[PDB]
Amino acid sequence: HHHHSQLENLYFQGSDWTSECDVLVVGSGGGALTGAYTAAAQGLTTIVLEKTDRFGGTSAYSGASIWLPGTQVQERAGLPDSTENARTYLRALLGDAESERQDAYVETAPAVVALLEQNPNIEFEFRAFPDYYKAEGRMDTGRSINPLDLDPADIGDLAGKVRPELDQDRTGQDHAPGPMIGGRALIGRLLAAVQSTGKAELRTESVLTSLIVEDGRVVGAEVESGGETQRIKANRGVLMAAGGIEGNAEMREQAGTPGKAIWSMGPFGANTGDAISAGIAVGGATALLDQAWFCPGVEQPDGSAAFMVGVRGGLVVDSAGERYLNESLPYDQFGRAMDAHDDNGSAVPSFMIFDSREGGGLPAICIPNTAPAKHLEAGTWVGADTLEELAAKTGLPADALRSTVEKFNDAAKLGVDEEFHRGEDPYDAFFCPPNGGANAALTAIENGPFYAARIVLSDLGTKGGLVTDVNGRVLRADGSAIDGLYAAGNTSASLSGRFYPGPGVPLGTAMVFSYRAAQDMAK
Numbered sequence: 001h002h003h004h005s006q007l008e009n010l011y012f013q014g015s016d017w018t019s020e021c022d023v024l025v026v027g028s029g030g031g032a033l034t035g036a037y038t039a040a041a042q043g044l045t046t047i048v049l050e051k052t053d054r055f056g057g058t059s060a061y062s063g064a065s066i067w068l069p070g071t072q073v074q075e076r077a078g079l080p081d082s083t084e085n086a087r088t089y090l091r092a093l094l095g096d097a098e099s100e101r102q103d104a105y106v107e108t109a110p111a112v113v114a115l116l117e118q119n120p121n122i123e124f125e126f127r128a129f130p131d132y133y134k135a136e137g138r139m140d141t142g143r144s145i146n147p148l149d150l151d152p153a154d155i156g157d158l159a160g161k162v163r164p165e166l167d168q169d170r171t172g173q174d175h176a177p178g179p180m181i182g183g184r185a186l187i188g189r190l191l192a193a194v195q196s197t198g199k200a201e202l203r204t205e206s207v208l209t210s211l212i213v214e215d216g217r218v219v220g221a222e223v224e225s226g227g228e229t230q231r232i233k234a235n236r237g238v239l240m241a242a243g244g245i246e247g248n249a250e251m252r253e254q255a256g257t258p259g260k261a262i263w264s265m266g267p268f269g270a271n272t273g274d275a276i277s278a279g280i281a282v283g284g285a286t287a288l289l290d291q292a293w294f295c296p297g298v299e300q301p302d303g304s305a306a307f308m309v310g311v312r313g314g315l316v317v318d319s320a321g322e323r324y325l326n327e328s329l330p331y332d333q334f335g336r337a338m339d340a341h342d343d344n345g346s347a348v349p350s351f352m353i354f355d356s357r358e359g360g361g362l363p364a365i366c367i368p369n370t371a372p373a374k375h376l377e378a379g380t381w382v383g384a385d386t387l388e389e390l391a392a393k394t395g396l397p398a399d400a401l402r403s404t405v406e407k408f409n410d411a412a413k414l415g416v417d418e419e420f421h422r423g424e425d426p427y428d429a430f431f432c433p434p435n436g437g438a439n440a441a442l443t444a445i446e447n448g449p450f451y452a453a454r455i456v457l458s459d460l461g462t463k464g465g466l467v468t469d470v471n472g473r474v475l476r477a478d479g480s481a482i483d484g485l486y487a488a489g490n491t492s493a494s495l496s497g498r499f500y501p502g503p504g505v506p507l508g509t510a511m512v513f514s515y516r517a518a519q520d521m522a523k
């Protein structure tokens, strides 16, 4: 499959519609299902198309922190926050560029949440996770909401259809004993809500192939399910929330997107730009394709990565064995700083230096979390009883590494990182449990043996794609809208530009613009 557009007159030379619906939704992420619910709940027949054999995609893998501020959820917690406070934070970071979509995101949040919580399968709650930048309107505790843990039993036959967490999915496993949490809860509840409307069809192994145009309006889509080809009519429109280009190496090389497909934490084979491609075909503009939701990734034996989040020890060096960033930085800034510092391989990979403080464990949350033994067997990590020998085994300058570590250890005993101010932020301190020092983020690495872990530039999906308006309408280069086509999530170029403002902005933008697209289609 390439994603070439059909004219209906052309297809009318032999074929005819194999199905029909008011709202066709391509994908089954947070956005897709939120747009599907918005449409089905108010009477529009909806068909949801999931390419793989599991609903949720990267949204299922997520922790389902959602940046929808100023809502009834934050009020129940008595949060010192408001729609206007949130608007200020976004303006202070992104500027006036895309200010209309900024306004729409922050202004629509409450309505999205009111509608979804109204369903008996959906309820959210505030959970503390700090916003990620020092700027007016920042929330040091955060303002993001999560779905409640869900007993799989409460959604029947939909639980087995939800994509399992990364610690199970990249190892041929299903959901474990632990109840549906984070992204698994988000998708389980939204599938249940969407089903409960009695106006929606949920399909797996149904792949978008081409949009169908008639007189320059999108009227439906070519789909591939069970060997054969289907032509699905869409009376009001098609919503494309099938993710980004994260799994398509060629589209990334072309755009100049840093990182690699094999490093992305998107489900292997799922998000390959199918929708973005299909949208360009029918005349859609694109932006920001070189941009991603970046994160450090712990390189794996199989050459893929694990999301490294909530760092609470060690330090990181370039190929010169010298710290170049605040290891406790939020993951998108961490990653962008690796990219900036890279002189043809000096920083990608970087090397995370740690000791036996965590009995051989890397002092951070790795998702998924491979056993140290497997890393050491494979040579992604390296271990030694001395820094001299560790530098030998890793090809790091031994004089430099040893200076870097003596200097870091000095700052740990002092309590301040003169070079990179590590631990001096509410995010940095959020993951650090108090030790016996003056700074919980700085812990001396003098306990043997010492380990070196290769860190690459991973991602949580791309954020470049089709240009959209405040209603998720796909636009041509001239600014005109392509009637019948709407895009959201990572299929749509982020209003957030080169910024990850705080936890849940991906799912948050996805859910608001998916919702707004349905509202537009309701007309």
Ligand SMILES: Cc1cc2nc3c(=O)[nH]c(=O)nc-3n(C[C@H](O)[C@H](O)[C@H](O)COP(=O)(O)OP(=O)(O)OC[C@H]3O[C@@H](n4cnc5c(N)ncnc54)[C@H](O)[C@@H]3O)c2cc1C
Residues within 6 Å of the ligand: 026, 027, 028, 029, 030, 031, 032, 049, 050, 051, 052, 054, 055, 056, 057, 058, 059, 060, 061, 062, 063, 064, 065, 066, 067, 166, 206, 207, 208, 209, 241, 242, 243, 244, 265, 266, 270, 271, 272, 274, 275, 293, 307, 367, 459, 460, 461, 488, 489, 490, 491, 503, 504, 505, 506, 507, 508, 510
């Ligand atoms: C471990 C982890 C934690 C994260 N935590 C959070 C968090 O807490 N909060 C947050 O906001 N973000 C978080 N993120 C990021 C977030 O998961 C993604 O950026 C977001 O879910 C992207 O949603 P999407 O709709 O763009 O993609 P997805 O959720 O992946 O949805 C895309 C779906 O479309 C399907 N699809 C693709 N092509 C086609 C086609 N042609 N036809 C039909 N279907 C197709 C795919 O199979 C997939 O099922 C996290 C990421 C990871 C890896």
Ligand SMILES: CC(=O)OCC(=O)[C@@]1(O)[C@H](C)C[C@@H]2[C@@H]3CCC4=CC(=O)CC[C@]4(C)[C@@]34O[C@H]4C[C@@]21C
Residues within 6 Å of the ligand: 062, 063, 064, 065, 129, 181, 182, 309, 310, 365, 503, 504, 505, 506
């Ligand atoms: C799972 C459990 O029992 O507790 C462990 C945890 O806290 C998690 O693993 C949860 C699965 C969600 C949580 C957070 C939620 C907020 C968030 C939103 C984003 O968009 C990016 C990802 C983060 C920063 C998140 O770090 C991931 C993963 C952790 C740390």
